[PDB]
Design a protein around this ligand. Structure first.
Ligand SMILES: C=C(CC)C(=O)c1ccc(OCC(=O)O)c(Cl)c1Cl
Ligand SMILES: C=C(CC)C(=O)c1ccc(OCC(=O)O)c(Cl)c1Cl
Lengths: 221, 221
């Protein structure tokens, strides 16, 4: 087809950021949910997954796997990856920091109960003292509406997406970072993003106990 | 200066792949080793590390952090990132799989003693059954000397680098993969790579107990 088919579990997981990028880009996509391990095996046996895993994203005739390979293609294809090689360097540096913090928040649900309070406290300390300050500082420096090159880029989409997850964790964290708050509002008002934020869009809900059990069953983790 | 300064601990760690890429590219670089936590704090306080961590790589007037942002810039700057957007998608998909397997091998030293035999057995099973087969299959498909676009790219450098580490883990693993063995030899004979492989080059040795203690001291992990 002409629409990108995203293959994954019906959840946030590792496919969510791809969803935010496609939507922010204004691209319509289909989602082929993996309901059972039989489904995942069918794909593996069909030879659609190079490294046996998902996310997988049928786009432009390719069966792309590995989150970063997917995001990189999409971001490039829709002019969300900066203008030159030097801009892409700043974007990559910002979004890999975002991806680091985000990987911590993502694994929190499957964190050992005895650790959960410490991991959560570690994460709040990195947000307050390391990442938010860094990004606030970038916005404060050029005083422009966007993080890189005074134009919308994947850096803004990925950052704002993280700002929502952090809000769900503790709304007070962003309070001392006015420029980040501003960016959150600003990007949230873009017609494409605003539509993704509304009810009924393919945006996914935070994971709970019920869905986590179904997932670690199929994927086994 | 005109030469890239790599700031890191005197070890393989997270900076090694940058070393293999620069060298394979034929670029000369300086290394400013971090001998003590005082050194690492000096950098942090000087404001050279955006997210407070290293590797950090002064290149082209930028102070790049985050391994992938660094590798991406270098690979682009020296024409090792494919010709078009679709080639970069295959490269990214291959090298992120390589980076996954590689992250497992990298953490093996700091793995809990009770686990070490299982992690090591897990890793040998993924190599034999998932990654090597996948890459052997790519080479077998186009029957060309390189992984992507019949030209040398970062995919070849990063793969071969991993082939060495796997050799150090168990030389028998690659035996059933003749095309990978071939690629290992072929890339190892490129004048630039061959020079990096020789004694005295900035290539780093596998980590031992002595150096691991010094490192987790400074970096604290
Ligand atoms: C919340 C999570 C629990 C660790 C999580 O991030 C996660 C990891 C892998 C998953 O699928 C497999 C995949 O390949 O992503 C899924 Cl569905 C989730 Cl939700
Ligand atoms: C062997 C290792 C032990 C876990 C390892 O990969 C590692 C991790 C971080 C390290 O520095 C800090 C950094 O930011 O990379 C270093 Cl020097 C090493 Cl060797």
């Amino acid at each position: 087809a002409e629409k990108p088919k995203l293959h994954y579990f019906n959840a946030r997981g590792r496919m969510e950021s791809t969803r935010w990028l496609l939507a922010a880009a204004g691209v319509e996509f289909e989602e082929k949910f993996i309901k059972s391990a039989e489904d995942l095996d069918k794909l593996r046996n069909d030879g659609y997954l190079m490294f046996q895993q998902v996310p997988m994203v049928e786009i432009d005739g390719m069966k792309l796997v590995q989150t970063r390979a997917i995001l990189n293609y999409i971001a490039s294809k829709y002019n969300l990856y900066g203008k030159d090689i030097k801009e892409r360097a700043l974007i990559d540096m910002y979004i890999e920091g975002i991806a680091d913090l985000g990987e911590m928040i993502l694994l929190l649900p499957v964190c050992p109960p005895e650790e959960k309070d410490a991991k959560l406290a570690l994460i709040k300390e990195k947000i307050k003292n390391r990442y938010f300050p860094a990004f606030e500082k970038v916005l404060k420096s050029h005083g422009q509406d966007y993080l890189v090159g005074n134009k919308l880029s994947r850096a803004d989409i990925h950052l704002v997406e993280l700002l929502y997850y952090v809000e769900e964790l503790d709304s007070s964290l962003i309070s001392s970072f006015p420029l980040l708050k501003a960016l959150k509002t600003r990007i949230s008002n873009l017609p494409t993003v605003k539509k993704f934020l509304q009810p009924g869009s393919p945006r996914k809900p935070p994971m709970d106990e019920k869905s986590l059990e179904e997932a670690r069953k199929i994927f086994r983790f």
